[PDB]
Amino acid sequence: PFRQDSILIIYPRSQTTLVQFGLNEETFTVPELEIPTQIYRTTRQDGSYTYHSTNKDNKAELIKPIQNGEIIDISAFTQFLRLIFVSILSDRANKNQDAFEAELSNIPLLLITHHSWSQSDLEIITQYVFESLEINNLIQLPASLAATYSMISLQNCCIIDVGTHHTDIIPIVDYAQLDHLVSSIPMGGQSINDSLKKLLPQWDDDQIESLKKSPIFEVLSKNSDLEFNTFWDEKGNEIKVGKQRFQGCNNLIKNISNRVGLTLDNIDDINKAKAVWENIIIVGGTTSISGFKEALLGQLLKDHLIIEPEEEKSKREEEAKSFVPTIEYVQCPTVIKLAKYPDYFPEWKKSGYSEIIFLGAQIVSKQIFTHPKDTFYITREKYNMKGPAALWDVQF
């Protein structure tokens, strides 16, 4: 144990699910498999359910198991995992045919979880992985920790994970996710869309979405020099736009910031707190919008930095006209910083770090699965003894 060919990482999210089977060994590659997170559920007279990849003869209903990051249908969710897992087996079993003795003989699974999943959901998933998929080794890695492990392993930090309809804020102290501080706001990328609809009434949804995803949309805090600029439709249609391309991100940025502030203010050990504020981690699709992260930082500074009020400072400098020492405050944060990205994953640098949580998982899985110690995953041994409850003896 274990073959690197064999490591399987799954990262399921509301819209899609990133998947990878086998680690490259030279450098880590950005996940190439992206499967939409949904399954079809046919209902068979007599009550029971059947699950397929396609609307079978238009008889099945379309189930989207994960919504706003939460599992809303645990049965369709487990069926969706099986569907992924089986597909991978078939694919490899064709290509190579001796696969069941090699690449498919011992498949350890790392499943990236979301803060919102029940213990009940996590146990059921564990049961499913050991009983239905007949897999033997499982790590359930929280998304937040994947984040901090990718980010050159930070003991103290805050994860701001911007989704489409919600943003999660998750403080990490001493490599532990602080559950009672964790929260999400019902606000994300779509907010930008919505802000823009108000500013550009005569546009439609696809036009607005296209602007957001275009080279000329940025958050300010040379394109910025031009009054108007140009970009091209999804359907090739050229669209011109004024100052609106520097708008629409503000309401979201303010909401996130207000939340970050209330959160970090409830970290009880001020020495931990100082560290967290100095390692803000921002992740998610939205964050790839040029200027966004820096704009968000800018706002956290504007709202939360402990520093002398400018008027007060200006008086003191007039007074000294007749050198001014710095006023020291008892509060934190006096320093706010974004955590430093690792620049030595070439493939990741190339594609941006909106999905860096996955790199977290590539690193953890290699660590854990290419070393003897079985301290951080459930094994068959353990499953046989405690069952799904085995899960809680290997939490991080």
Partner: protein, 54 residues
């Protein structure tokens, strides 16, 4: 091949249920759900490549 048999041929053994349990000292008056071990007696495929990015 049959998905179920693919699952069966890879990765090579108990089963648990989540059910009512009534502890004893004989038996306490109360119940509670837990993961109990069971006694002796107790669809499709998708094509990657569509989902591969290109």
């Amino acid at each position: 091949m049959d998905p179920q048999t693919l699952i069966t041929k890879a990765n090579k053994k108990e089963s648990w249920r989540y059910d009512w349990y009534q502890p004893s000292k004989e038996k306490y008056p109360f119940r509670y759900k837990t993961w109990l071990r069971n006694q002796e007696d107790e669809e499709d495929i998708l094509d990657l490549k569509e989902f591969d990015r290109r």
